[PDB]
Structure formats: C-alpha cells, structure tokens
Amino acid sequence: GSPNSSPASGPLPEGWEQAITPEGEIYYINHKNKTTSWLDPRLETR
C-alpha cells in the first residue's frame, strides 16, 4: 500500500517507532519522553 494504503492503516507517527530491544524482544519506543512501553501499537484499535 506504498501510496498510503499501508503506511496509513499501520503507520508510525513521530513519537512512536517500533523496534527490538538488545535482548531481541519486540517493543514500541516513545521518543516523546524517551520511555519504553509494551502497550499495543499506536493505532491498534481501541
């Protein structure tokens, strides 16, 4: 969905980038206050 279909249904807004910890566990990074959280992705779907 290059044009948008994909980076629009599961994008990563500035302040929420997905990555992996040195341990290898997958988690989300909050650059807003430099903190680590395991809460569902940005959009998720509350």
Side-chain angles (χ1 to χ4, degrees):
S2 18
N4 254 202
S5 146
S6 20
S9 44
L12 298 78
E14 290 165 19
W16 296 100
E17 189 176 308
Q18 178 173 328
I20 71 304
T21 30
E23 184 178 345
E25 188 176 13
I26 200 168
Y27 81 127
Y28 280 65
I29 302 167
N30 198 358
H31 298 257
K32 290 180 177 180
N33 44 189
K34 294 288 197 175
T35 66
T36 76
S37 87
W38 320 83
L39 80 99
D40 328 321
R42 166 257 147 176
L43 177 55
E44 172 45 289
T45 175
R46 355 74 338 101

